Amino acid sequence: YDIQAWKKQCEELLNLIFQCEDSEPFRQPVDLLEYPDYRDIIDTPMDFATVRETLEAGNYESPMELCKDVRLIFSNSKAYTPSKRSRIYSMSLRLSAFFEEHISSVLSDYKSALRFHKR
């Protein structure tokens, strides 16, 4: 029933993601010299360094907010990909499965802890 526990859980999940080769494309911003049309397709860039920095700045109130930004990384990859069999998109889908597998308990425990606080 620890209402704060999600934050370290998210820090340790981001550490796992940063160790994962599938996160390589999603750590830092997209260079427009390399993808000149990226912002013609993607309105709101997002990457795992920005998620980690937002977390470490104390600028997430809940793991749901972190989960919306992580999911935006994946939806951007799906929107930008020219093919569902692209290398970078294919890395996004595996990383997304890994992230959803690990975040499900973090969200559950947080919401459980809030409910207990409100009881």
Ligand X SMILES: COCCNC(=O)N1CCN(C(=O)c2ccc(C)o2)CC1
- How many residues touch ligand X under the rule CB under 6 A: the total is 14
* DSSP state string for 34-67: TSTTHHHH-SS---HHHHHHHHHTT--SSHHHHH
Residue 112 host element (H or E): helix 87-118
Q: Six-digit token pair at 54?
A: 């937002």
Query: Which CB, 31 or 61, lies closer to ligand X?
Result: 31
94 binds ligand X (CB under 6 A): no
86 binds ligand X (CB under 6 A): yes
Q: Using CB under 6 A as the criterion, which residues of the chain lie in contact with ligand X when the complex forms?
A: 24-25, 28, 30-31, 34-35, 77, 80-81, 86, 88-89, 92
